[PDB]
């Protein structure tokens, strides 16, 4: 719903507050999202590069 990105999506085990959509890291990069339809938190990592 607006957040455009690339990466691997994985089942999370963090717990947002029930009004927060996505989570950010220190140095400010999106690293978690919440799926709008099912409302579950998913981690996002950078595609296996190097």
């Amino acid at each position: 719903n607006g957040l455009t990105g690339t990466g691997v999506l994985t089942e999370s085990n963090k717990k947002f507050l029930p009004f927060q959509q996505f989570g950010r890291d220190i140095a400010d990069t999106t690293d978690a999202v919440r799926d709008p339809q099912t409302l579950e938190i998913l981690d996002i990592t950078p595609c296996s590069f190097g």
Partner: protein, 268 residues
């Protein structure tokens, strides 16, 4: 009466999870150790930039607020009420009693006498804090309910306020009031200013502590270093620049001004 907040009126600036990260924000906050009015049991107050609002009881005497610019007809206003049933947000043009309230038979609501042109409806001891703000036609409300182990005095401690509501109204606001349940059978008001804070985030993502970075030199140092611990030393923190007043505009006299007294003052 007036009283002193200690560390009160901290709200989550927005969504977005977060953990242990002394994150720095600029926003409208209630400064630490402020001068908060005290009210007992009430009058028309200002708004001017957001509002902190706590309250204490076991019964429910505080039964919502009313907002707006004129608190009458000829201009629109909000109305937030709670009978013994549940909350009733409402936005019409009203005619408000200059002393509006509700009774407690248990018949009540001498609040207004008009409900015209409604543009939004909705229906459905203790310490109850609220932060009200109004930006870009949205009226945001944060809140928190902590249990005191007193009855009706402002305690001390830290407790961050979580967002509740969002209303795309468009309404202008300059004044507000309160609503009380009479007798038939304590509350404070702070104001918010643009400050800069340093919030400490837990590993679950909750705000556990904060630093107001304009209280004293120690806090400005903590903000400059982005930490809560500071070892003995000395650091460059800002700058001092004298201020100039008035603007003196110097110039020359007026020798060859203009001899208009010839063309506009001729005899023929």
């Amino acid at each position: 009466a007036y009283t002193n907040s200690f560390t009160r009126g901290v709200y989550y600036p927005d969504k977005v999870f977060r953990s242990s990260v002394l994150h720095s924000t600029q926003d409208l906050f209630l400064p630490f150790f402020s001068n908060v009015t005290w009210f007992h049991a009430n009058p028309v107050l200002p708004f001017n930039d957001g509002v902190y609002f706590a309250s204490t009881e076991k019964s429910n005497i505080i039964r919502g607020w009313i907002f707006g610019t004129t608190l009458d007809s000829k201009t629109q206003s909000l109305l937030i009420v709670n009978n013994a049933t549940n909350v009733v947000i409402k936005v019409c043009e009203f005619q408000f009693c200059n002393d509006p309230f509700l009774g407690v038979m248990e018949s009540e609501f001498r609040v207004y006498s008009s409900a015209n042109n409604c543009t939004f409806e909705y229906v459905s001891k203790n310490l109850r804090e609220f932060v009200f703000k109004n930006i870009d036609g949205y009226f945001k409300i944060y809140s928190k309910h902590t249990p005191i182990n007193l009855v009706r005095d402002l305690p001390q401690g830290f407790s961050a306020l979580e967002p509740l509501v969002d209303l795309p109204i468009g309404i202008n606001i300059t004044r507000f009031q309160t609503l009380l349940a009479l007798h038939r059978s304590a509350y404070y008001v702070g104001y918010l200013q643009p400050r800069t804070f340093l919030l400490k985030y837990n590993e679950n993502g909750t705000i556990t502590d904060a630093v107001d970075c304009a209280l004293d030199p120690l806090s400005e140092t903590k903000c400059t270093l982005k930490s809560f611990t500071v070892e003995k030393g000395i650091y460059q923190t800002s700058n001092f620049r004298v201020q100039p007043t008035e603007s003196i505009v110097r110039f020359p006299n007026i020798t060859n001004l203009c001899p208009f007294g010839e063309v506009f003052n001729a005899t023929r």
